[PDB]
Write an enzyme that holds these catalytic residues in place. Structure first.
Site, short mmCIF file in Angstrom:
data_model
loop_
_atom_site.label_atom_id
_atom_site.label_comp_id
_atom_site.label_asym_id
_atom_site.label_seq_id
_atom_site.Cartn_x
_atom_site.Cartn_y
_atom_site.Cartn_z
N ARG C 102 -91.92 7.93 24.48
CA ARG C 102 -92.03 9.39 24.60
C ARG C 102 -91.53 10.04 23.33
NH1 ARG C 102 -88.81 10.63 29.79
NH2 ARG C 102 -89.37 12.76 29.17
N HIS C 132 -87.18 -5.50 28.50
CA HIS C 132 -87.62 -5.44 29.89
C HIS C 132 -86.93 -4.40 30.76
CE1 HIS C 132 -87.11 -9.99 29.00
NE2 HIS C 132 -86.00 -9.44 28.52
N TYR C 135 -84.60 1.91 30.57
CA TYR C 135 -84.77 3.29 30.14
C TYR C 135 -83.70 3.64 29.11
CZ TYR C 135 -84.43 8.39 30.07
OH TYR C 135 -84.33 9.72 29.71
N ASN C 146 -79.00 -6.44 21.18
CA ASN C 146 -79.80 -6.93 22.30
C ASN C 146 -79.57 -6.04 23.51
OD1 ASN C 146 -81.57 -9.14 23.52
ND2 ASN C 146 -79.84 -9.03 24.98
N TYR C 156 -78.47 12.20 32.00
CA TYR C 156 -78.70 13.50 32.63
C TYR C 156 -77.79 13.58 33.83
CZ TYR C 156 -81.31 16.86 35.56
OH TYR C 156 -81.69 17.94 36.33
N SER C 174 -77.58 -7.68 31.02
CA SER C 174 -78.56 -7.15 31.96
C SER C 174 -77.99 -6.19 32.99
CB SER C 174 -79.19 -8.29 32.76
OG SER C 174 -79.63 -9.32 31.92
N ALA C 192 -73.08 -8.40 31.90
CA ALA C 192 -74.16 -8.03 32.84
C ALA C 192 -73.62 -7.26 34.04
CB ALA C 192 -74.94 -9.28 33.31
N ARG C 209 -66.46 -5.88 37.09
CA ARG C 209 -67.10 -6.88 37.91
C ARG C 209 -66.17 -7.32 39.03
NH1 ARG C 209 -69.51 -11.79 34.64
NH2 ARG C 209 -71.13 -10.23 34.23
C1 LIG Z 1 -77.04 -16.81 29.96
O1 LIG Z 1 -77.12 -15.39 29.76
C2 LIG Z 1 -75.98 -14.70 30.07
C3 LIG Z 1 -74.80 -15.33 30.44
C4 LIG Z 1 -73.66 -14.56 30.74
O2 LIG Z 1 -72.47 -15.14 31.10
C5 LIG Z 1 -72.42 -16.58 31.04
C6 LIG Z 1 -73.73 -13.15 30.69
S1 LIG Z 1 -72.31 -12.15 31.03
O3 LIG Z 1 -72.71 -10.85 30.61
O4 LIG Z 1 -71.82 -12.47 32.30
N1 LIG Z 1 -71.24 -12.70 29.86
C7 LIG Z 1 -71.69 -13.03 28.56
C8 LIG Z 1 -72.26 -12.04 27.72
C9 LIG Z 1 -72.73 -12.38 26.46
C10 LIG Z 1 -72.61 -13.71 26.00
C11 LIG Z 1 -72.04 -14.69 26.81
C12 LIG Z 1 -71.58 -14.35 28.09
C13 LIG Z 1 -69.90 -12.86 30.26
C14 LIG Z 1 -68.99 -11.82 30.08
C15 LIG Z 1 -67.68 -11.96 30.50
C16 LIG Z 1 -67.26 -13.14 31.10
N2 LIG Z 1 -65.94 -13.27 31.53
C17 LIG Z 1 -68.16 -14.19 31.30
C18 LIG Z 1 -69.47 -14.05 30.87
C19 LIG Z 1 -74.91 -12.51 30.32
C20 LIG Z 1 -76.03 -13.28 30.01
N3 LIG Z 1 -77.28 -12.73 29.66
C21 LIG Z 1 -77.71 -11.46 29.76
O5 LIG Z 1 -77.03 -10.53 30.18
C22 LIG Z 1 -79.15 -11.27 29.33
C23 LIG Z 1 -79.38 -9.97 28.58
C24 LIG Z 1 -80.86 -9.95 28.31
O6 LIG Z 1 -81.68 -9.73 29.18
O7 LIG Z 1 -81.28 -10.18 27.07
C1 LIG Z 2 -74.59 12.11 32.05
O1 LIG Z 2 -75.24 11.58 33.22
C2 LIG Z 2 -74.39 11.07 34.18
C3 LIG Z 2 -73.01 11.14 34.07
C4 LIG Z 2 -72.20 10.60 35.08
O2 LIG Z 2 -70.83 10.65 35.01
C5 LIG Z 2 -70.27 11.41 33.92
C6 LIG Z 2 -72.79 9.96 36.18
S1 LIG Z 2 -71.80 9.28 37.49
O3 LIG Z 2 -72.75 8.98 38.50
O4 LIG Z 2 -70.89 8.37 36.95
N1 LIG Z 2 -70.98 10.65 38.01
C7 LIG Z 2 -71.63 11.91 38.07
C8 LIG Z 2 -72.74 12.12 38.92
C9 LIG Z 2 -73.39 13.34 38.94
C10 LIG Z 2 -72.92 14.39 38.13
C11 LIG Z 2 -71.83 14.21 37.29
C12 LIG Z 2 -71.18 12.97 37.25
C13 LIG Z 2 -69.62 10.49 38.33
C14 LIG Z 2 -69.26 10.20 39.65
C15 LIG Z 2 -67.92 10.01 39.97
C16 LIG Z 2 -66.95 10.09 38.98
N2 LIG Z 2 -65.61 9.89 39.31
C17 LIG Z 2 -67.30 10.36 37.66
C18 LIG Z 2 -68.64 10.56 37.34
C19 LIG Z 2 -74.18 9.87 36.29
C20 LIG Z 2 -74.97 10.43 35.29
N3 LIG Z 2 -76.38 10.37 35.30
C21 LIG Z 2 -77.20 9.63 36.07
O5 LIG Z 2 -76.82 8.87 36.96
C22 LIG Z 2 -78.67 9.80 35.74
C23 LIG Z 2 -79.56 9.81 36.97
C24 LIG Z 2 -80.96 9.92 36.42
O6 LIG Z 2 -81.52 8.98 35.87
O7 LIG Z 2 -81.59 11.07 36.54
#
Ligand SMILES: COc1cc(OC)c(S(=O)(=O)N(c2ccccc2)c2ccc(N)cc2)cc1NC(=O)CCC(=O)O
Ligand SMILES: COc1cc(OC)c(S(=O)(=O)N(c2ccccc2)c2ccc(N)cc2)cc1NC(=O)CCC(=O)O
Ligand SMILES: COc1cc(OC)c(S(=O)(=O)N(c2ccccc2)c2ccc(N)cc2)cc1NC(=O)CCC(=O)O
EC number: 2.7.7.23
Lengths: 222, 222, 222
Positions: C102, C132, C135, C146, C156, C174, C192, C209
């Protein structure tokens, strides 16, 4: 055969042109059923109309759309590569591009559905928006509702399907899972990332969030 | 040139018609390679066949599909705007609309892939379903598995790619992240919204969920 | 009328062919505005060019793309069913299939945007990837980043829009929600499934998490 039916398509396109529809390319238009239309209707290339379809005045249909057994109100704008089946759009709705409306999709006046959104047996209220990356199934969504990107109705438990109800004036934060059956009261706010397993009161925030933390000097695998 | 190659396309379309394929519009069909087909095959408008492709009997291909170097079993239904590359579909699969199968995608008999689903080097077992908004990469998915909307395989850690294995009869709740390498045992259930970082036992529930809470009279920014 | 304008399209297609553009089917091409191009440009079937568009050398545009008021650098590859409006692509970008750019989408050299990705007023840096189901709105994303599948900018709040900034060399796991305004420092890693509500330091992990747990012999509804 193929060629004969193709000739019949040319005939329908010509007749649509004579009846005042703007077809951008009559050679790239298909009607497999019946089409009723108002005035000033514009249909772009590679559109396929199937079953019994009715369009109001000033409806604009962008390239590549497939519209089957649907009712489209005045002033609707259907953006490119949108598939619509057994749906009803009120006046002034905007859907797509890359929207997929399945049977039972019902949009009220001025509703918006964006890209990579799927609706099935779901009503989206007046001025309500589901702009991105969302699945709404077996759902009632009220007026002036914002359905954030990544929102999903968890409607199917492997056995049955259950209904989600969202009241007017609700903000649904991004990546919310609505675990059906569930009701979200008017004026409520769902925090981004929430898994909503319980009903939400009017004017209440629902949240299920681990506080963010940080680990310093964290090295990714080589 | 352009025009000469276009004439060659007309030739191939005519020959396909003579060989018993139903082309909805021979002027809107492209074959860039070789196509083998069974009987009663139906191909809608704006389909492009690339490389070496084989289709079984009664295969139906909806508008706008691109199918490259793929094997499509009897009775498969490929819905509109689906892109298929180096994939194999067993009999009676249904994919799309707006599905994207990349090389190594392997679907077993009666498998379903819905809208806004991407598969790469991933096998989807017999009667298994991935209906919406999902990425399955480097994955083995067993038979009778439900892959909920929003499920993602986290297969790439910035350095390498790792394999996800999901057993038969598994229910994967919506918006699950499968953090590879991981194995989910037969009969297991993953709760919606779960981040699956550890193997899951047969017939076990895996969950990682903050209980929902509510704050009353919560006012969004004006 | 329809037919006259269609003749004018044939004229433009013929002129493009004479100027050295490869149109796969001049009968299935539309230009509604002006097109400037380099050498060895290849445009597949059912492409629509709108407004004022400029393409560099060796640009390849796959079937069904819609490109409006955009600047496309040398060697870019735009895969099928990609919609591009008021965007700029540097050299050697690859986008689609099923990408939606857009206005304000700005891709730097060698950037990649995959399927079911939407960008609005967002810059994706050099060699950065959003492959993939994502937004990205109102965002600055640095080089060598990445963006994992399922990542969403929460830009918003129902009232205003806010900016997300992601530094160079960031890994976004992810299904991350980036809750704007937020800044993620160079070299940081987002786990993730993280909901990022607070700024992230350089070379730090951000995580939110619940540890996974399991319940044995858990039976789904019959
Ligand atoms: C094997 O792929 C992953 C392993 C993983 O985890 C194996 C974590 S994780 O986020 O859990 N993680 C991590 C992140 C980056 C590199 C290695 C690990 C993670 C974070 C904290 C802790 N304590 C453990 C793992 C994330 C991914 N991959 C993705 O998120 C894909 C993103 C994409 O679509 O391209
Ligand atoms: C700036 O946008 C946001 C801020 C935010 O947060 C800044 C939270 S939040 O959910 O974390 N949040 C919140 C929700 C609505 C209005 C203002 C804030 C929130 C909820 C609880 C607490 N304690 C803090 C924030 C959510 C959004 N936006 C969206 O979720 C976009 C939805 C869409 O795609 O149209
Ligand atoms: C009504 O649908 C659901 C209910 C539900 O929940 C009602 C849970 S749950 O995951 O919260 N859950 C559960 C899972 C399977 C069967 C029944 C319930 C669950 C898990 C643990 C606990 N303690 C409670 C519920 C999940 C779903 N549905 C989906 O996830 C849809 C998947 C898809 O898109 O096809």
């Amino acid at each position: 055969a193929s060629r004969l039916e193709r000739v019949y398509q040319s005939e329908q396109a010509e007749k649509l042109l004579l009846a005042g529809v703007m077809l951008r390319d009559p050679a790239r238009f298909d009607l497999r059923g019946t089409l009723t239309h108002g005035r000033d209707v514009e249909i772009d290339t590679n559109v396929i109309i199937e079953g019994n379809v009715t369009l109001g005045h000033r409806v604009k249909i962008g390239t590549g759309c497939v519209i089957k057994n649907s009712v489209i109100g005045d002033d609707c704008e259907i953006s490119p590569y949108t598939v619509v089946e057994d749906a009803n759009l009120a006046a002034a709705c905007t859907i797509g591009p890359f929207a997929r409306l399945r049977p039972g999709a019902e949009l009220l006046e001025g509703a918006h559905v964006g890209n990579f959104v799927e609706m099935k047996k779901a009503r989206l209220g007046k001025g309500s928006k589901a702009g991105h990356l969302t699945y709404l199934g077996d759902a009632e969504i009220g007026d002036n509702v914002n359905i954030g990107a990544g929102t999903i109705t968890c409607n199917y438990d492997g056995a049955n399907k259950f209904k989600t109800i969202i009241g007017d004036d609700v903000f649904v934060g991004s990546d919310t899972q609505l675990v059906a059956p569930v009701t979200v009261g008017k004026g409520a706010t769902i925090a981004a990332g929430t898994t909503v397993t319980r009903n939400v009161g009017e004017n209440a925030l629902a949240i299920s969030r681990v506080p963010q933390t940080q680990k310093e000097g964290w090295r990714r695998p080589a």
